[PDB]
Symmetry: C4
Subunit: 30 residues, 4 copies
């Protein structure tokens, strides 16, 4: 239930943050 | 119950981080 | 024990990430 | 035990995010 869904949501957010950071890095590298 | 409250706070902070990174991405690429 | 220490470490990391993002924002604003 | 393993993974991802943000900060300010 709630603990496992919150953990899943957190892991999804961390994945999305990692993508955003990789995109920013690529933008800075041109 | 305590774990649930801490995980909820973690999710909220990650959501705020995502928004801040979306803004930085838009500043660099917009 | 371990659950509470891991949660504390995570909350500290989130705080540090929020500072880094605020610093980056200020750097972009000059 | 499961919570402990997920929290450990969350801490590891946050550490990686911190490093990526330190690099971006250095690119902009260095």
């Amino acid at each position: 239930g709630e603990i496992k869904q919150q953990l899943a949501e957190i892991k999804q957010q961390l994945a999305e943050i990692k993508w955003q950071l990789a995109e920013i890095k690529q933008q800075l590298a041109g």
